[PDB]
Write a protein that binds this ligand. Sequence first.
Ligand SMILES: Nc1ncnc2c1ncn2[C@@H]1O[C@H](COP(=O)(O)OP(=O)(O)O)[C@@H](O)[C@H]1O
Length: 350
Amino acid sequence: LRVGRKFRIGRKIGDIYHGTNLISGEEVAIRLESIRSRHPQLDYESRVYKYLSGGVGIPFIRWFGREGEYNAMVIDLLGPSLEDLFNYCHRKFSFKTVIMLALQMICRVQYIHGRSFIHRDIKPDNFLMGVGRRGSTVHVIDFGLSKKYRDFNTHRHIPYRENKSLTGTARYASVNTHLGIEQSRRDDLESLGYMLIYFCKGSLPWQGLKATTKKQKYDRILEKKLCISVETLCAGLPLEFSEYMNYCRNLKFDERPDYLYLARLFKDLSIKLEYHNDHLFDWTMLRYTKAMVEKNDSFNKVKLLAMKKFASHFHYCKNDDKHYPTPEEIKQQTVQNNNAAPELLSAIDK
Ligand SMILES: Nc1ncnc2c1ncn2[C@@H]1O[C@H](COP(=O)(O)OP(=O)(O)O)[C@@H](O)[C@H]1O
């Protein structure tokens, strides 16, 4: 079970495994693919990782190639995905966490696009926090569906094309992806927009649909994405979220996104909400509070204490809201958070 010269395959995670550099003892991750795969992808994915190497929050690939009857890829060991953490937090994130996530993910996408690639599978499962002290950094994974959208030298954009079949995940797919249009930079950013809204509101209104065929499900999703107003979609969110969505839906096919303009939506908002970009995420504070306590109902209790102790960090979308709340309206929740409630309030101060 040796890979390259110095890496040993350990337990499954997991065709991805824990691994170990035998010289240094560093824990890594190791992805295997059979050379009898009908649809090889790992060599392509390795090569994209390698071309993207050096960008912030891009997993660093340590080794890749053929080993025995496997293609193998040795890469940084990362932590939980955003979908895992979303579940850990019972499927809603605070505005602060979504903002801090948005700021990092926009930079990740900007970096990838600046290397002439589009990801094409932007979704919560494909962003992981680092392990340990790197838990503060959002990383991007799974480049198997990525694609070069312009020439490396001339920056000549790939041609406008129609009739493409949907790839990959319908829930976060852009409207133009549903319509069969060649994906480009705008579509990565639109998907990231659906994620942000999903994180804030707890769901997207086209989840849980059923149909008689694959195509019919996709089209029922498309109709909701097309026919729902941005106001309904973004109900209860500060205006920045609908402006982000409106911006992505208006980008032309070959158009260079103004990434700084989009980052400024969230950075300017963070300042108005009095959030420091301190990488203190919802899970970080929930996990910490539970640690102190232990010295679904149980979670609700931990959460109540966390939101009391960290009253100015935990502001949530109210899904009954029909309007976009102002920052002052959102910050009223700090007062409510401190107004909640003996031996437990004592332990929390401690
Ligand atoms: N570099 C990495 N370090 C640690 N875990 C990873 C890494 N890359 C992917 N994972 C995790 O390994 C698990 C198995 O991944 P995989 O089965 O390929 O994803 P999926 O089940 O969505 O197809 C996932 O939970 C994913 O978050």
